[PDB]
Symmetry: D2
Subunit: 310 residues, 4 copies
């Protein structure tokens, strides 16, 4: 199978590296306006393959995406000096206006995986331009935050991360919602399980975990300038789910008809991911606070998108 990646920057290239090291697909094609950039990353990664799995990583044009089951959209422009977020947001939106058509022209049956930030708005942008069914356009959303939430809970509770069922939903960023109320461990309520195991989650413990999840991007950016290793692996996992028609549940962003009253907005919710993209939503129980937090965040996202023209 073949996987395409448009945008060969740190996110795009890290994703290609992870796909290679984990042997997710036989062929990986990197596409970027900067031809040499893509060729360099591809060749650098190709030197790693003898030490992992036989994967053919190369740079190419949109036409080379022919037959790709999934195409990652990690395209964007470097923020020029004297430019606001809304100014930059408009530019990346323009980039997508070009990229989306090109990609589909070569591979009209691929699932589109949006990674460019802000992921939720850009997922909506890609969806409107794709003219494809809602489920065919998926954004990475809160997949990393959900996984980190489970990891921190697992450490606190002294249990395997695989046994922790917990989600981070909504808008990827400072307004994301940590769903404490309906989280579970081995099927039993989280908080209940914690206390019972002599590892009660106190308000202080919850605050510490919240900052551990919510401010990860902040800390990483402050120390290295950008984040990419985590999302590269997360994206590689979503690609794997699509290529293997896994039908697994992931907190990813997708165009949603209605969310707590808010209409036509893209945000993260637990969704079944397979060969055709997302094919079902598993809405969990929410506390009044979580539901209200999700609603308000969705409301804002709807306006942010509408204001941008989508």
């Amino acid at each position: 199978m073949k996987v395409g990646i448009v945008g060969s920057g740190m996110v795009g290239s890290a994703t290609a590296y992870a796909l290679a090291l984990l042997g997710v697909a036989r062929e990986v094609v990197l596409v970027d306006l900067d031809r040499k950039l893509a060729q360099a990353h591809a060749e650098d990664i190709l030197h790693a393959t003898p030490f992992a799995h036989p994967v053919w990583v190369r740079a190419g044009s949109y036409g080379d995406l022919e037959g790709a089951r999934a195409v990652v959209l990690a395209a964007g422009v470097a923020q020029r000096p004297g430019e606001t977020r809304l100014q930059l947001l408009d530019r990346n939106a323009q980039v997508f206006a070009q990229v989306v058509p090109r990609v589909l022209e070569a591979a009209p049956e691929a699932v589109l995986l949006v990674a460019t930030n802000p992921v939720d708005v850009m997922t909506q942008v890609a969806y409107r331009l794709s003219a494809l069914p809602p489920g065919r356009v998926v954004g990475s959303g809160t997949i990393l935050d959900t996984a980190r939430f489970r990891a921190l809970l697992a450490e606190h509770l002294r249990v395997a991360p695989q046994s922790v069922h917990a989600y981070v939903l909504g808008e990827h960023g400072d307004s994301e919602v940590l769903v404490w109320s309906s989280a579970q461990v081995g099927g039993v309520p989280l908080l209940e399980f914690a206390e019972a195991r002599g590892r009660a989650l106190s308000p202080e413990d919850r605050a510490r975990i919240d900052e551990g999840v919510r401010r990860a991007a902040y800390r990483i950016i402050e120390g290295k300038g950008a984040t990419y290793y985590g999302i590269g692996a997360g994206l590689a996992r979503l690609v794997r789910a699509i290529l293997t028609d896994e039908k697994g549940v992931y907190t990813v962003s997708a165009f949603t008809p209605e969310v707590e009253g808010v209409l036509e907005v893209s945000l993260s919710l637990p969704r079944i991911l397979g060969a055709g993209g997302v094919e079902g939503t598993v809405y969990p129980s929410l506390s009044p606070e979580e539901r209200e937090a999700l609603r308000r965040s969705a409301e804002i996202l709807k306006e942010a998108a509408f204001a941008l023209g989508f």
Copy 2:
């Protein structure tokens, strides 16, 4: 790390094969009073290692178990003509009486993983003989049944098995309890998820799934005479959980102080498994019918153990 296996029959040898092919441990030691049998299985398996992972599989004595972090007890004798179920149980209890102390002399820190049928009674037997804390003696229990239950549900629902949370508890056998009431998918009630999925579970569907889980052993034995491939892999997975101090949740058998009023009995419940054996029980919500079923099961196992002298 080293893993020991006492009893080199089809179950013990299949377990060694699975451990080798999955590369669970660097060294596997097969111990059997029938030394030629153990040597033959060990050499046969050693010939497979070049095609999988570097694992030293060898036949040895109790003394060769020194340093083992886990020792699988798949020891026992073949039923003789004219011998009843109870007489066979007594002979196997006697085998464990010789096996347990000799294993512990050589590998004092080992977790004992019991596989010999009936697994719940044999787990109680090993526990009493070991003089170790309750957590150090674990029986494979219902792990295969739980896995089959989740697989059949996943197939019916067209969802990843990893997203299905369903358990089979109690006695590994005819009285096991399929916990339908609290089964969940993606964190939501089974029946509800099935409805939203357009894959509702009819009475006929549930009956089919029940027979698929409950009668598997019967079908396999009727066709080949004995079961061993499934448990060999299940045991290998439990060994991995122990060696890696995974602290994952598995429906395995272990000595339990109290179960629905029944005192000091060994049966399967969801338990946290790590380097020291089981270290926590995650009791799921049960319907009145499932509770009575489990209580009945426990009472049966309790009387059987007591009658045997344990």
Copy 3:
């Protein structure tokens, strides 16, 4: 992809187990005149899959082999007391006369991987019956012996097996040829490397290594009654090579135009293995003694084929 296995005895079922544990193919079909036997082994193995890889192991008819890219032939008959060598050979040839055409009727594209003993004679039988090109019929041959030879040399020299280049050729059995003469380590002559590393190979060392390789089958049979774990994994590796169009070198048996003067005979030589079966021979340098042994071996194999009419 789908892999078929005709003959659901210990060799065939162990091959299915190895294929499943290693995740070589997504679908494995066991075919046997004893339907219950195949169904029982298939279900037993299916219960192991949740603990390894998603692999659909099932029992089926020859019709269920449609689209299989590789089909293992592990069918045969149990020798009858007082039956001559040639008579047993006759009976197995008659089984292949029924098996081969029925497999190819359903899977005209299948590479036939012969496992039935004597593997070299049966590979010749399958070749003649198939009417396919020479490379499409491959016997497991001496793969296990070659790997064991490399393993023993690696242990003696204290170097990784992957760095030892040594072959066992000819007839799989007591007459196989250990190619000491041109064996190499890291690209250097074996004996020279051995001395440089202060681990010289004395005539005594070589004799012990020869026995460890040549008498392995005998030892396992005397203790277990039959061998199967090793070949199961070896066959699974050959199946992987075929399915991935690996084009790797393996000492497997195939119809050869000429071997040291002997014409039209099947035996093991280093061959390139891919999706179409063997596609090239890499003939190694041989000493006068090794060549003579090989010639005599080929001569005997051709005679056995002549008696059967192949």
Copy 4:
């Protein structure tokens, strides 16, 4: 087991990413004068682990390297906009003067795996400073070049890379030597084999392959600005060899008493790598031209070491 990495730039962090994604070790510790940089890379990578293997990646001090079986030295400084070769070299030499003693103080039994360019001179520096046996200090050397040489030859011949025995020796740079004369396939002479398989290596082919191997770094640096993905995986494989006491053969750099007349110089040769570092050299046959090219390469490196004072 624990693996330390000093220097959390692109090479150091990519190595940590590869180690984590491949699940090489349970603990990976990143150390860097720029504490926030190391913490940032560690947390970014930690967000990837839930999607691969349970690996504890963290940032720490030299003290946190306690018990590390292998410590990767990817230390140095970012060449200031305007510097020169010898300058940067002397600065990195000074960094190593600070790093080496600190590392061995915390992890006295660790093997030092050098990655910093020029890898050969830096390995010599590390060796002299360590006061440890020659085998304890190993440089990644030409491992990526050797693997690429094999990959390109394998593609041209249409055979598995695993069956191609070819080396790139000497300086990991412009004077490296592609050993064509004694390269083999399946153990037989590569050149003659290619010819016999109808895939002869023409002067044009050899020139293309030489450029593909030798100029890779130039192409990558020109398009990306730096290379790191390849070496990250190569280093991860060498670390794996050390942790598992593999004793496999790799073309890595180590202090060599004498090579083609040149004395006391570090360069790449086929070496046996294990828990104690390199423990043996496997010198291959060389043509007069290759032997002279290697002599010159060694002299270039000797002169480079002299200028630095090691």
